[PDB]
Amino acid sequence: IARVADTVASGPSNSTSIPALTAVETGHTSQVEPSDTMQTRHVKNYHSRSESTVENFLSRSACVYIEEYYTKDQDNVNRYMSWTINARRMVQLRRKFELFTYMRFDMEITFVITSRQLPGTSIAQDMPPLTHQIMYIPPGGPVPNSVTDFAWQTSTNPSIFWTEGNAPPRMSIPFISIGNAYSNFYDGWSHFSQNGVYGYNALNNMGKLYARHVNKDTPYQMSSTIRVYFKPKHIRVWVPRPPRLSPYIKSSNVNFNPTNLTDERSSITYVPDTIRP
Amino acid sequence: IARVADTVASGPSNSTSIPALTAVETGHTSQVEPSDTMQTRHVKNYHSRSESTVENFLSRSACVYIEEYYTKDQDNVNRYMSWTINARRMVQLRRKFELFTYMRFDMEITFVITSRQLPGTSIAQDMPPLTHQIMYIPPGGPVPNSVTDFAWQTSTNPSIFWTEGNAPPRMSIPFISIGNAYSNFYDGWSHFSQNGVYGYNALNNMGKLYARHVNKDTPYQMSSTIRVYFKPKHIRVWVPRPPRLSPYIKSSNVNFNPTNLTDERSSITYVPDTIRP
Amino acid sequence: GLPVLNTPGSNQFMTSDDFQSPSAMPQFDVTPHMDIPGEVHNLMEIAEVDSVVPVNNIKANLQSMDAYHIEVNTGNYQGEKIFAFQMQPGLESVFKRTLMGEILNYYAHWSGSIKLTFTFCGSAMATGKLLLAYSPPGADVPATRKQAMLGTHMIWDIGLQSSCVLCIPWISQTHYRLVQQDEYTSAGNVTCWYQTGIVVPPGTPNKCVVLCFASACNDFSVRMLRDTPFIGQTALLQ
Amino acid sequence: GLPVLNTPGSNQFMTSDDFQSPSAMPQFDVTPHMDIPGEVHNLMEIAEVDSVVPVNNIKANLQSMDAYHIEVNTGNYQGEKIFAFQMQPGLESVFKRTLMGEILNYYAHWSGSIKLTFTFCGSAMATGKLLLAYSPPGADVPATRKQAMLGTHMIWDIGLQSSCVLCIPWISQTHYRLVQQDEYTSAGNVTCWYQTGIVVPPGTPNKCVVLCFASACNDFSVRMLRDTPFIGQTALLQ
Amino acid sequence: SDRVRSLTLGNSTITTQESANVVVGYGRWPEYLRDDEATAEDQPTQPDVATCRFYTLESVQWEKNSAGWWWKFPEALKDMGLFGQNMLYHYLGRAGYTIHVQCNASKFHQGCLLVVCVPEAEMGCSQTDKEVAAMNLTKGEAAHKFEPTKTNGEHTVQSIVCNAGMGVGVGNLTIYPHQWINLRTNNCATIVMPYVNSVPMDNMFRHYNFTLMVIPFAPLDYAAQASEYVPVTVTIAPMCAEYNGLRLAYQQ
Amino acid sequence: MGAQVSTQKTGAHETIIHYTNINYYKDAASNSANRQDFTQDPGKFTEPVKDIMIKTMPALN
Amino acid sequence: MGAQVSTQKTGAHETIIHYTNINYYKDAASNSANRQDFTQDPGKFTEPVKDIMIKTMPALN
Amino acid sequence: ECRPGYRREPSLSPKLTCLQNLKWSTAVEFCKKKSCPNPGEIRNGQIDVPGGILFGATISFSCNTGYKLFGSTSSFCLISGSSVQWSDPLPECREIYCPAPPQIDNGIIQGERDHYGYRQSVTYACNKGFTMIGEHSIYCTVNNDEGEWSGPPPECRG
Ligand SMILES: CCCCCCCCCCCC(=O)O
Ligand SMILES: CCCCCCCCCCCC(=O)O
Secondary structure (H helix, E strand, O other), X not given: OOEOOOEOOOOOOXXXXXXXXXXXXXXXXXXXXXXXXXXXXXXXXXXXXXXXXXXXXXXXXXXXXXXXEEOOOOOOOOOEEOOEOOXXXXXXXXXXXXXXXEEEEEEEEEEEEXXXXXXXOOOOOOOOOOEEEEEEEOOOOOOOOOOOOHHHHOOOOOEEEEEOOOOOOEEEXXXXXXXXXXXXXOOEEEEOOOEEEEOHHHOOOOOEEXXXXXXXXXXXXXXXXXXXXXXXXXXXXXXXXXXXXXXXXXXXXXXXXXXXXOOOOOOOOOOOOOOOO | OOEOOOEOOOOOOOOOOOOOEEOHHHOOOOOOOHHHOOOEOOEOOOOEOOOOEHHHHHOOOEEEEEEEEEOOOOOOOOOEEOOEOOXXXXXXXXXXXXXXXXXXXXXXXXXXXXXXXXXXXXXXXOOOOOEEEEEEEOOOOOOOOOOOOHHHHOOOOOEEEEEOOOOOOEEEEOOOOOOOOEEOOOOOEEEOXXXXXXXXXXXXXXXXXXXEEOOOOOOOOEEEEEEEEEEEEEEEEEEEOOOOOOOOOOOOOOOOOOOOOOOOOOOOOOOOOOOOO | OEEEOOOOOOOOEEOOOOOOOOEOOXXXXXXXXXXXXXXXXXXXXXXXXXXXXXXXXXXXXXXXXXXXXXXXXXXXXXXXXXXXXXXOOOOOOOOOOOHHHHHHXXXXXXXXXXXXXXXXXXXXXXXXXXXXXXXXXXXXXXXXXXXXHOOXXXXXXXXXXXXXXXXXXXXXXXXXXXXXXXXXXXXXXXXXXXXXXXXXXXXXXXXXXXXXXEEEOOOOEEOOEOOOOOOOOOOOOO | OOOEXXXXXXXXXXXXXXXXXXXXXXXXXXXXOOOOOOEEOEOHHHHOOOEEOOOOOOHHHOOOHHXXXXXXXXXXXXXXXXXXXXXXXXXXXXXXXXXXXXXXXXXXXXEOOEEEEEEEOOOOOOEOEEXXXXXXXXXOOOOOHHHHHOOXXXXXXXXXXXXXXXXXXXXXXXXXXXXXXXXXXXXXXEEEEEOOOOEOOOOOOOEEEEEEEEEEOOOOEEOOEOOXXXXXXXXXXX | OOOOEEEEEOOEEEEEOOOOOOEEOOOXXXXXXXXXXXXXXXXOEOOHXXXXXXXXXXXXXXXXXXXXXXXXXXXXXXXXXXXXXXXXXXXXXXXXXXXXXXXXXXXXXXXXXXXXXXXXXXXXXXXXXXXXXXXXXXXOOEOEEOEOOOOOOOOXXXXXXXXOOXXXXXXXXXXXXXXXXXXXXXXXXXXXXXXXXXXXXXXXXXXXXXXXXXXXXXXXEOOOOOXXXXXXXEEEEOOOOEEXXXXXXXXX | OOOEEEEOEOOOOOOXXXXXXXXXXXXXXXXOXXXXXXXXXXXXXXXXXXXXXXXXXXXXX | OOOEEEEOOOOOOOOOOEEEXXXXXXXXXXXXXXXXXXXXXXXXXXXXXXXXXXXXXXXXX | OOOOOEEEOOOOOOOOOEOOOOOEOOOOXXXXXXXXOOOOOOOOEEEEOOOXXXXXXXXXXXXXXXXXXXXXXXXXXXXXXXXXXXXXXXXXXXXXXXXXXXXXXXXXXXXXXXXXXXXXXXXXXXXXXXXXXXXXXXXXXXXXXXXXXXXXXXXXXX
């Protein structure tokens, strides 16, 4: 089905046919194959590009964020999580998405929440299972300012209640973008006067995500770390582009430091001698 | 299916047709569209009002109550929960329901019960999993006066037994109202002499809900917090009305404080200049 | 039994799920259905109903009927802007609370046209022509009538027909816009001017009230369910 | 209920699984699909596009266009190797970063032929013949033109047709090779020599640039999904 | 002979006797917005021949040490006849564009340019800790140029060529609609770009749909007494230009 | 069984899109929400007039 | 039910290889990935020329 | 009347009217900021335009890697007599040169040059009878506005 091209058996040649000669100036990539520049044998190639599919390539859960929130109200520790959803803080997944200019797809979101008890001299407890609450707040919705804010009522905002021990919570979401496709790159501004925000943040706005412990309080300080995972499915991509070369500096723009095109070597004719009997 | 109206292509005009002119005095809302007051192009609108459905709007679990009950019998702490069922103590869901005068629907009720161990110097325990019991008592049924009352026998009253760690208990209920529809507003009294109770509480009576720990006792004081969630389904609504403007004061009536119609601004002609190159 | 494998997301509780569940009251005989007047099927049925808009929402009128009053006077007032505001059905303080905007605040996305109906409440002897203009995002707000006149406008002639509709067409780049509109999803502005003026006979008021109504069209629609930021509390009511 | 038995692997979370899951946003009206130009279906569509190869990747040129320059001069240079490198589409520093190699680094296995297109950028008066040879693994790198000539070679004659393709056939023992090529999965080497020489008229440069392009053929394919070793971080970006 | 070609748009016509075929965007050719993909309800305006014609920008000089140049559209054409006038008076725009880069020398000169059209060519800043200014991204028909070395400007674009000011490899820009101008075979380069964006239409001042980059991979060179002045002129013509949201002109 | 196949809501890969459903409980109150009932009739609130009013005509005459 | 039988990917014992699928959710976004869509058209990027170029012929003439 | 340095907008009235409400009519942009000359170009440099080039605007300068900036690092569009003029002239980006490469005992430099700039290199060669100890070449590195050879030259053992 997604099979690869076979190699036709070719023999000697001596004609005005010039498949090897061309002109890249046309912007046309040569469509030559081994059988065109040598004598080849017939080969029934059964190989398949099934795993090169944009679907199989991007459809794999990848971490996009991670924050920690405590249980007790001691010191200036955040007791809840806040996050302006986006996939530009994790270089791995961010680099893949940026292989294309525009994207369209549904998505499977999985959460890996783990807790712990902070070190201490006398910390003997017996706390029941910790239950967490993850609430999604689309742009404009009321934001909670405490682990007891009325906003956690989740009247209409989607929210998940998960208790430790059980399988990591998950749920799918459609294609939210108000545009016909998500934009990984936006060479424009937010204001017509050509100023303000520049790039991604200028238009993308998937809202925010908040988390917290629904448990009232813990005898001794404890903390939990939530890890968000994205897995696009039913994918569509447009306009491919040069992969990221320079390391990512900011998660709001494409700033970078002049990076080398590639690793170095002795000379253009350098090739390590691996045959030494 | 629930698609939106398309825009017919319109051209120049010069007739006695006056679609723009009307008279609101009739109480009739103008049915004009862009194509009636300008030249428009044909546009196949595929947008859908599928999420504007009263079903999709109200069919989302929203917290309606929350109380805490302890395990040990120390001090004057309640060891069980009591609640006169109603959705007027949580402004969020209450405001939505009040967008309509009458309602009819079945409902999915979910409970999020979480426990904890109160702080202390020496609180080393090893308590087994805590099992809870939620019992619904329709109007007239015997009410328990202790965590060991005979009423907890649940001979005929619906009751749920849940142990921490497992998925939050849930169960559906039909349309209980003795009327043909639930009433969010009742501009009347409970007594014929036009006195006594006024409004909602005058007729609504969904009974009470009690909770407790089925565990005999805990070495050291512990408490649990139960959160009730309502999710109406198979919805029907009648007589829409102006959304709540003034903050909710009481959960028994519609009392309020003179609130502003909306936020203020410089002048009627004030419009922020967002274009400044 | 049947070999089964639990998938991630098991035993969780998502407020927006939709599964079946055992009834706590088996064989309950639901009360007979009664056909009640004015049933609502889609919230858009409400957002399509005209509601008075508080255009004159200045601090001094935030609690009086003057908030809805849009005065117009007799005499030369050329070059003077009767009123103006942004096109933010759910964010603009002017629309923020109308039936329409009030509903949009339960959603994050919106799309479609809007019908701004203006009603002259002066006397039957007062006459006049007003210029209702709408300028799409891109340039500064019309400072003069000429600038406003270059955009989508409607010249309303007061007469027997009290009301006049200024339909604001949906001229956006994207299919949808955020109710929490930012500069990117800007909608533009609406400015009103004097096309001619308000002439009046002797023994007749010189100041008249002009009410403004706003509602959605048959091409309007919301999309992202969210909680409204116009209601909250600090503790359980009692 | 139906007697069920949970199998090992239940409640786990495998990043590469593929199950169904409840939508957090029921009945969401997705934005209408728009036909956008240049859609990608398979990543191989990208690896099949020629991209300039930095053959002259010496420390001094790791950040200049000279990295792509492959100089050729007039005069006797017989016995001199113009350039050479290993055939490691994803490991060789020369290909490691090209569109082709850049993609292979997201996979661990690869197979197929490669098209090395060479373009003469000298003047229209310069002429010459170069010998582009490819030697499969097994023996030492060609030290002389005779040794290189014994392998799969292509004699490129510079003329009106600026470019010339040297298709490196897939001559491997195994069906696939590791992108992280080791000696076992060796691919061989590619050496360029002067078939004749570069003759030039008076008043014309003596040094010319020869660009190199690399891309996959219709018989190419990757196979083992992995993370690319060309991107990382030490903390969440901000 | 496929070497010679002629282009005709509006009242403008370009001639060539040494071209190398014509690259057509991503296989697509400019087309007006269809009804089943439109959003703006108002009837669009289509000046046609009035705006869809060849606009020549300020020429540039190619020197032995030139590192490259770049233009941003449709911004670069803000002051070009009626095409620029419609940009001012309208909120939304949509166009095709036929890029035609000219550059002739002689059989005795040598060099190779890379004419590319990069959609959403979001660029980085010289000082990674600061931001860039529109003034440094695009300045009308005046071209910005790449530098063979790192830049330092406060809000300047990292003009270092090797990274194309995008943090990528220049050798991979071939993945975008492009052509080369190998003086020994070429004389110009043409690219027909179709409207590429994640939206049916968009503002033409706030958004720079695509960037035209002309980067030389083969340094310009020649002998003594050989014309040292080798200019590179860029000509572009909008295609299927549509406009929506008519209002008071925007003050630049 | 008493399976009932319906149509799913459009996905992010449009322009096998159907699901199956079976009720296991005896009470209709146990069934899932009716998220696919798209009925409309704004007339009740937008045009509750006794005499039909034609848009292209004067409201009063 | 609305079962839909498809073909599985070749196993390590080739040269009953089919699976069954049923969607339980109402939203298409809930369905599993489309790991079996094998469409291709490199022409967009490899041969975006206006005039078809025949391999066995000169690029320019 | 336009101030300095502003210019009249032909499309608008520089006049205001006293309305009945004792308020002056809304003012338009009848007088706009005079635009400064195009900053130009810096050979082997870059001009950062954060906020246009009109009166009151500022622009910064930088030099590509391998070049040192000579002059001002910025310029302001101030009002100069009858118009708006850039405060400081365009600076200079002069090539950074490495120190003369080192000569080595019993070895030479192949194709020795006059100057050596960023990324340029020097390759050594031991005389007949001697053996090279170390890398053949070194490279001109240019941290930080001063040029420096990558490392030490090779050595020739007889
Ligand atoms: C209920 C959680 C909602 C989370 C929304 C995530 C949307 C991700 C969109 C990613 C956009 C992009 O990568 O260009
Ligand atoms: C088994 C638990 C029974 C709970 C009954 C809840 C009934 C809710 C009725 C809400 C009435 C209203 O909102 O007007």
